[PDB]
Amino acid sequence: KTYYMDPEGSDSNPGTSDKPFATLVKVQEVVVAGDVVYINPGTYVVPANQVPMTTTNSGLYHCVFHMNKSGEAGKPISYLANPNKQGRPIFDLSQVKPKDQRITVFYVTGSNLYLKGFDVIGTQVTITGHTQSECFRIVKGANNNKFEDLRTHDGMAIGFYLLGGSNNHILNCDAYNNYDSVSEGGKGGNVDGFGGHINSSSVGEGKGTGNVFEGCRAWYNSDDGFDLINCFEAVKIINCWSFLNGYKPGTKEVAGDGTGFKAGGYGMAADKLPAIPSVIPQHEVRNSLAYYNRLRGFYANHHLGGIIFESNTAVNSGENYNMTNRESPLALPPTDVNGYDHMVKNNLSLVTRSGSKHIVMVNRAKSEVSNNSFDGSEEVIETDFISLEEAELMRDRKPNGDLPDVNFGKLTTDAELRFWGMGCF
Ligand SMILES: C[C@@H]1O[C@H](O[C@@H]2[C@H](O)[C@@H](O)[C@H](O)O[C@@H]2C(=O)O)[C@H](O[C@H]2OC(C(=O)O)=C[C@H](O)[C@H]2O)[C@H](O)[C@H]1O
Ligand SMILES: C[C@@H]1O[C@@H](O[C@@H]2[C@H](O)[C@@H](O)[C@@H](O[C@@H]3[C@H](O)[C@@H](O)[C@H](C)O[C@H]3O)O[C@@H]2C(=O)O)[C@H](O)[C@H](O)[C@H]1O
Ligand SMILES: [Ca+2]
Ligand SMILES: [Ca+2]
């Protein structure tokens, strides 16, 4: 019941400790509910000519791994970095460059799956126009899953991209240094760290609800860190950090929208009314940190209703809090109005950077806006913080995947009294 795989392994082997597998394709040929797969640490380079497991959207996508099989309730399938060995499994996909096809590395339709402790790097984009690739894409039917301590970095693909599925828990994952340098002149406008976009086909309790990002970090993603546009059920972002998004990796060169948390929206299309859910979901961002994104930190992103921004810290992220909503009902032309039905509470905002701002575009008559540092009588300053050394945010996680201890953006005990019960620490 416990299978093994290894970069110096063979798919002709039975998949034991002494003689392990070599690819997840063979793994998907055997597994059933309850079984474990220990993925031994090292670099697995996916061959250039490895046939896809499936395709979607009429051959628009090469799907490298179809995570199609399911566990049962209390009996999951578990794909796990081998916990008896140091280091991490790394799937390299630099070589996978199929002709005129988008790439999904993990395409998830199965339920009760548990994926932990490995990396996906080098995911390609070869298409020239409006395109994207994804490391993980999750759709209608993929329920009750867990993705933990998975790192999606140093490629061109979106980290995690949700079009459907229920109660998926994305825990302690990192999505960084991702940038599409090939398509549309290298804008990188489609490459987010984390993307919650539960489509019209996947609504209903048990079908699109209860998806949560938690403990995740998103940095140097060319577009946004986290994005919940075109999201029909409520997604929650808890205890996450989004920083240095909107830039080409390792620089302050302009790429995409550079939002830390784009926590709603259905677009401001001038030509047509966008499709929307009948109940506008109250998304939540909570106990989360935004720092030095290109343009904005915590952003309602033209949402058609309420959002919770509770107990977040925001530092030098352009517009740190922006609550801009689209007017209701849907109307052309698309007109922006002061944010309505929001819960904005217990947040902290440091602005020392040229052009940045504490809050914009909220209606205090129509939203609950209480106990935020930017509304207090005393302005927040650099001395109030124990550290502001940004390299501490890129510290390697604890051995069990939890976010590392950081002094960054944490108040001093003196400052904690003058800003009490404010911020994500
Ligand atoms: C309607 C609104 O447009 C967004 O961005 C615009 C503009 O493109 C950007 O360069 C400027 O700095 O900010 C503007 C703004 O109103 O915020 C952005 O949409 C773009 O990216 C995404 C996305 O990341 O999901 C979706 C759209 O297809 C694309 O045009 C924003 O999310 C959107 O609500
Ligand atoms: C194959 C196409 O898939 C669909 O379109 C999706 C999406 O529904 C559109 O809103 C748009 O989304 C863009 C970016 O692609 C996305 O990364 C970002 C989160 O939001 C918008 O910026 O295009 C998408 C796409 O994959 O092209 C629809 O099913 C289309 O009908 C279909 O052509
Ligand atoms: Ca964009
Ligand atoms: Ca985005």
Side-chain angles (χ1 to χ4, degrees), residues 1-261 263-425:
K1 66 157 53 50
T2 313
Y3 296 110
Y4 293 76
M5 64 176 282
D6 196 275
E8 265 258 296
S10 185
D11 292 336
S12 296
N13 290 342
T16 65
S17 198
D18 194 21
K19 280 170 274 164
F21 296 138
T23 64
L24 287 176
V25 176
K26 182 56 174 205
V27 168
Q28 293 298 82
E29 202 202 308
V30 298
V31 293
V32 280
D35 298 335
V36 179
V37 180
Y38 283 147
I39 305 169
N40 294 2
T43 313
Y44 299 79
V45 186
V46 177
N49 71 333
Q50 195 186 263
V51 295
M53 289 200 77
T54 190
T55 80
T56 68
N57 307 78
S58 310
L60 184 50
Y61 279 92
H62 178 111
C63 302
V64 181
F65 304 123
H66 192 194
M67 306 309 300
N68 66 326
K69 291 173 165 183
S70 289
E72 294 174 318
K75 272 173 66 59
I77 305 184
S78 297
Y79 313 87
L80 306 174
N82 195 350
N84 286 313
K85 297 180 188 294
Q86 309 300 322
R88 297 176 53 92
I90 294 142
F91 296 95
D92 182 7
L93 297 100
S94 66
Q95 303 305 263
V96 182
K97 300 188 180 209
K99 200 182 298 182
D100 288 280
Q101 265 188 312
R102 293 182 183 182
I103 311 190
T104 300
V105 182
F106 287 82
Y107 167 51
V108 183
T109 55
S111 308
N112 295 116
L113 304 176
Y114 184 23
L115 285 77
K116 197 199 157 165
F118 61 84
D119 283 38
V120 180
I121 69 172
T123 322
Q124 293 292 115
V125 161
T126 54
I127 292 151
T128 80
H130 171 71
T131 197
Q132 51 181 79
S133 297
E134 312 101 21
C135 301
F136 293 85
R137 180 154 57 93
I138 307 169
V139 296
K140 181 260 153 214
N143 300 311
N144 303 330
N145 297 317
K146 198 166 162 199
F147 308 88
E148 180 174 9
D149 202 359
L150 304 178
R151 304 182 195 171
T152 61
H153 67 99
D154 300 272
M156 314 197 195
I158 292 143
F160 296 83
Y161 187 77
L162 281 66
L163 294 176
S166 195
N167 290 1
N168 297 268
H169 192 179
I170 297 84
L171 183 56
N172 290 338
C173 296
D174 289 341
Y176 63 97
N177 289 356
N178 297 315
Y179 167 45
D180 176 2
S181 59
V182 177
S183 86
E184 308 194 69
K187 183 76 200 267
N190 292 343
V191 184
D192 294 339
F194 298 80
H197 314 296
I198 304 294
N199 66 36
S200 60
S201 78
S202 195
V203 300
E205 196 191 41
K207 293 164 181 168
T209 56
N211 295 297
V212 171
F213 301 107
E214 201 197 324
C216 296
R217 298 184 292 184
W219 80 87
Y220 287 131
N221 295 294
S222 58
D223 195 53
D224 302 318
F226 292 79
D227 182 350
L228 305 182
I229 208 182
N230 297 323
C231 203
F232 286 48
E233 294 291 356
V235 185
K236 305 183 187 188
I237 293 163
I238 302 182
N239 192 21
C240 292
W241 314 332
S242 190
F243 63 98
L244 299 162
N245 299 298
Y247 297 115
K248 295 176 200 182
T251 64
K252 298 278 159 60
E253 273 223 317
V254 170
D257 303 341
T259 317
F261 305 87
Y266 299 96
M268 299 284 279
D271 79 310
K272 70 206 162 183
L273 301 158
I276 53 158
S278 322
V279 168
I280 302 303
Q282 186 183 55
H283 302 309
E284 304 179 24
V285 180
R286 282 154 66 77
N287 312 113
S288 298
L289 177 50
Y291 160 75
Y292 230 117
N293 294 289
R294 194 169 75 75
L295 282 176
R296 317 176 169 85
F298 301 86
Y299 185 35
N301 197 44
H302 319 274
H303 201 50
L304 297 166
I307 280 153
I308 306 210
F309 289 115
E310 217 218 331
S311 314
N312 304 299
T313 292
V315 177
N316 281 339
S317 190
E319 292 158 7
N320 278 350
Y321 301 93
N322 174 345
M323 301 296 130
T324 310
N325 270 22
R326 181 167 173 165
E327 191 169 59
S328 219
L330 287 173
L332 301 179
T335 61
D336 274 330
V337 303
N338 282 8
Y340 52 90
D341 306 347
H342 299 314
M343 294 284 144
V344 189
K345 297 181 178 177
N346 313 135
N347 301 290
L348 189 45
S349 178
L350 176 61
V351 169
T352 57
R353 160 194 177 195
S354 173
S356 280
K357 303 179 188 199
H358 298 304
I359 200 157
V360 298
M361 295 287 271
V362 73
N363 185 310
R364 291 162 196 275
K366 296 226 186 194
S367 299
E368 247 80 68
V369 185
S370 57
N371 202 243
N372 302 281
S373 70
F374 53 77
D375 290 325
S377 298
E378 290 179 289
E379 189 111 18
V380 169
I381 53 176
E382 300 133 62
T383 42
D384 296 321
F385 294 95
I386 295 161
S387 171
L388 294 172
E389 279 159 313
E390 81 192 275
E392 295 174 5
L393 295 179
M394 303 160 174
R395 270 164 168 170
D396 295 335
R397 292 172 168 280
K398 288 157 176 176
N400 57 39
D402 297 320
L403 286 148
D405 290 338
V406 303
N407 283 324
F408 192 92
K410 169 161 140 71
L411 299 169
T412 62
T413 54
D414 171 80
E416 280 209 319
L417 297 190
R418 300 189 297 98
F419 300 115
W420 186 213
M422 287 183 167
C424 58
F425 317 112

